[PDB]
Amino acid sequence: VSRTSIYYYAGSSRLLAVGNPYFSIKSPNNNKKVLVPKVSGLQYRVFRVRLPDPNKFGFPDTSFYNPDTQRLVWACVGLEIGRGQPLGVGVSGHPYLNKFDDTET
Amino acid sequence: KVVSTDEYVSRTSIYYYAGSSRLLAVGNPYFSIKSPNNNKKVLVPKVSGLQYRVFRVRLPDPNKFGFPDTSFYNPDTQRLVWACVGLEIGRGQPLGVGVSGHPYLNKFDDTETSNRYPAQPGSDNRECLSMDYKQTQLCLIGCKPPTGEHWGKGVACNNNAAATDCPPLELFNSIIEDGDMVDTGFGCMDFGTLQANKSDVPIDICNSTCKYPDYLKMASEPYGDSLFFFLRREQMFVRHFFNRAGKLGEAVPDDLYIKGSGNTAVIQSSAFFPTPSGSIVTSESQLFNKPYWLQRAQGHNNGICWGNQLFVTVVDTTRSTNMTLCTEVTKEGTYKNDNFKEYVRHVEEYDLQFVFQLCKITLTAEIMTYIHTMDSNILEDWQFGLTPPPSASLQDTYRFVTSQAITCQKTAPPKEKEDPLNKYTFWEVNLKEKFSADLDQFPLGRKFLLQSGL
Amino acid sequence: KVVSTDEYVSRTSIYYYAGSSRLLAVGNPYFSIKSPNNNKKVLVPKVSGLQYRVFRVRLPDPNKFGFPDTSFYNPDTQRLVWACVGLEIGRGQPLGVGVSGHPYLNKFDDTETSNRYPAQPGSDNRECLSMDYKQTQLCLIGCKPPTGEHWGKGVACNNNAAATDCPPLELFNSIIEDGDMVDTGFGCMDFGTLQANKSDVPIDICNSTCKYPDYLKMASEPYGDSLFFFLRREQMFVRHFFNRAGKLGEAVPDDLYIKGSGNTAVIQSSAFFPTPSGSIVTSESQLFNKPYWLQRAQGHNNGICWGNQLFVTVVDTTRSTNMTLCTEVTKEGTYKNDNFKEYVRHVEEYDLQFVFQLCKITLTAEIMTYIHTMDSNILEDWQFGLTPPPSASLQDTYRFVTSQAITCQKTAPPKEKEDPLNKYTFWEVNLKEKFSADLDQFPLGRKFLLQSGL
Task: Give CA–CA dist B147/B227, Å, rounded.
Answer: 10
Amino acid at the residue C449: L
Q: How many CB atoms lie within 10 A of CB A60?
A: 11
Q: Residue B207: name the closest of B180, B176, B175, B245 by CA.
A: B180
In a mutagenesis test of the B interface, which of C150, C160, C171, C221 is the best target, namely the one with the most B β-carbons within 10 Å?
A: C221
Which bin fits C392, alpha (ψ -120 to 50), beta or left (φ > 0)? left
Q: Are B397 and A15 in contact (CB < 8 Å)? A: yes
Report the alpha-carbon distance of residue A24 to residue C414 in Å, rounded: 58
Find out whether C65 and C286 touch, Cβ atoms under 8 Å. no
Contact partners, residue C268, CB within 8 Å, separation at least 6 = A95, C109, C115, C119, C243
- Angstrom distances, CA of residue B390 to CA of C224, C370, C373: 12, 15, 12
Q: In what order do the strands lie in the sheet with B435-436?
A: B353-357, B15-19, B435-436
Does some domain include residue C165? yes
If we measure between CA atoms, which residue out of C210, C213, C177, C216 comes closest to residue C192? C210
Judged by DSSP in three states, C263 sits in helix
Minimum CA–CA partner of C166 in chain B: B405
**B442 to chain C, minimum CA–CA distance in Å?**
40
DSSP conformation letters of C43-85: EE-B--SSB-EEEEEEPPPSTT---S-TTS--TTT--EEEEEE
Q: Which residues of B fall within a CB distance of 8 Å from C163?
A: 405
Nearest-by-Cβ selection for C267 from A18, A93, A95: A95
Nearest to B176 by CA among B188, B186, B159, B163: B188
Type of residue at B218: M
CA angle, corner A96, sides to A90 and A98, nearest 5? 100
Cβ B32 vs Cβ B445: under 8 Å: no
> Nearest CB to B397: which of A13, A56, A64?
A13
Closest residue to C272, CB basis, from A14, A20, A92: A92
For chain C, which chains pass the contact test of at least 3 CB pairs under 8 Å?
A: A, B
Omega before B118 within 30 of 0, i.e. cis: yes
The alpha-carbon gap from A91 to the nearest alpha carbon of chain C, in Å, equals: 7
Q: Do B392 and C222 touch (CB under 8 A)?
A: yes
**C-beta atoms surrounding B196 within 10 Å:** 6
DSSP string, B340-379: --EEEEEE-----EEEEE-EEEE--HHHHHHHHHH-SGGG
Residue C239 sits at φ, ψ, to 5 deg, of -120, -50
B138 neighbors B230 (Cβ within 8 angstroms): yes
Are C185 and A88 inside 8 Å of each other by CB? Answer: yes
Range of the domain at B174: 9-452
| Beta bridge partners of residue C17, listed in sequence order | C355
**Whole-number Å distance between alpha carbons of B28 and B51:** 13
B2 located within any domain = no
Least CB–CB distance from A102: residue in C113, C188, C236: C113
Q: Which of B394, B407, B410 sits opposite C169 (nearest CB)?
A: B407
Euclidean distance between CA atoms B224 and C141, whole angstroms: 56
Please list, in sequence order, all residues whose beta carbon lies within 8 angstroms of the beta carbon of residue B206, skipping any fewer than 6 positions away: B102, B191, B192, B198
Nearest to B407 among C164, C170, C217 (CB): C170
The verdict on a CB contact (< 8 Å) between C163 and A35 is: yes
Sign of CA dihedral C423, C427, C430, C435: negative
Q: Under a CB-based contact definition with an 8 Å cutoff, are residues C107 and C242 in contact?
A: yes
Interatomic CA distance for residues C16 and C90, integer angstroms: 19
Residue C430 resides in a domain = yes
Inter-residue contact B93 to B320 (CB < 8 Å): no
Please tell me the distance in Å from A22's CA to the nearest CA on chain B: 16
| Pairing status of strand B315-316 against strand C170-175 | unpaired
Q: Which residues contact B332 (CB under 8 A, 6 or more apart)?
A: B339
The residue of chain A with its CA nearest to that of C271 is A92
Resolution in units of Å: 4.1
Of A18, A23, A93, the CB nearest to C272: A93
Find chain A residues with C-beta within 8 A of C169's C-beta: 18
Q: How far apart are CA B177 and CA B159, in angstroms?
A: 38
Q: Which of B74, B76, B382, B406 is the best residue to mutate to test the C interface, defined by the most C CB atoms within 10 Å of its own CB?
A: B406
> Are the Cβ atoms of B400 and A33 closer than 8 angstroms?
no
Regarding beta strands C10-19 and B33-34, do their DSSP bridges make them parallel or antiparallel, or are they unpaired? unpaired
Give, in degrees to the nearest 5, the angle at Cα C249 between C244 and C254: 105
- Out of A20, A95, A99, whose CB is closest to C268? A95
d(CA B204, CA B31): 7
Tell whether B1 is covered by a domain: no
Write down the experimental method used for this entry. Answer: cryo-EM
d(CA B81, CA B241): 55
B8 within 8 A of B23, measured Cβ to Cβ: no
Nearest in space to C356 (alpha carbons), one of C89, C74, C65, C62: C62
Calpha distance A44→B386 (Å, rounded): 42
- Of B453, B447, B449, the closest CA to residue B90 belongs to B447
Q: Pick the residue of A4, A51, A59 with the most B CBs within 10 A to test the interface with B by mutation.
A: A59
**Is B217 contained in some domain?**
yes
C-alpha B33/C-alpha B42 separation (Å) is 6
Our CA-based measurement puts residue A52 at a distance from the nearest CA of chain B, in whole angstroms, of 11
CB spacing of B390 vs C222 below 8 angstroms: yes
Q: In this structure, how many other beta carbons lie within 10 angstroms of the beta carbon of residue B436?
A: 13
Question: Nearest C-alpha of chain B: how many angstroms from C350?
Answer: 35
For residue C3, tell me if it sits in a domain. no
To probe the interface with B, which of C2, C147, C157 has the most B CB atoms within 10 Å? C157
- Chain A nearest-CA residue for B63: A57
- Work out how many domains chain B is built from and give that number: 1
Whether the Cβ atoms of residue C239 and residue C275 lie closer than 8 Å to each other? yes
* Contact (CB, 8 A) for B314 and B89: yes
Quick check: is B399 in a domain? yes
Cα C447 → chain centroid: 29
Tell me the chain B residues in contact with residue C1 when contact means C-beta distances shorter than 8 Å: 76, 386
Give C166's contacts in chain A (Cβ within 8 Å).
36
CB B360 within 8 A of CB B73: yes
Chains with ≥3 Cβ pairs under 8 A against B?
Answer: A, C
Neighbours of chain A (3+ CB pairs under 8 A): B, C
Please give the residue of chain A at the shortest CA–CA distance from C186: A88
Angstrom distances, CA of residue C8 to CA of C50, C72, C359: 41, 16, 11
Rounded Cα–Cα distance for residues B405 and C169 (Å): 9
Rounded Cα distance between C343 and C348, Å, is 17
First-residue to last-residue Cα distance in chain C:
38
Question: Which member of A34, A36, A60 has the closest CB to residue B437?
Answer: A60
Rounded distance between C-alpha atoms, residue B449 and residue B440, angstroms: 8
Pairwise CA distance, residues B345 & B323, whole Å: 5
Closest residue, chain A, to C260 (C-alpha): A96
C-beta of residue C173 within 8 angstroms of C-beta of residue C336? no
| Rounded-to-integer distance, Cα B54 and Cα B311, Å | 7
Give CA–CA dist B203/B208, Å, rounded: 10
Q: What's the full length of chain C, in residues?
A: 454
* Distance (Å, whole) CA C91 – CA C105: 33
Task: Determine contact, residues C309/C279, Cβ cutoff 8 Å.
Answer: no
B140, B213 Cβ separation under 8 angstroms: yes
- Tell me which amino acid residue C178 is: D
User: Contact C161/B403 with Cβ under 8 angstroms?
Assistant: yes
Spatial distance between the Cα atoms of B12 and C178, rounded to a whole number of angstroms: 61
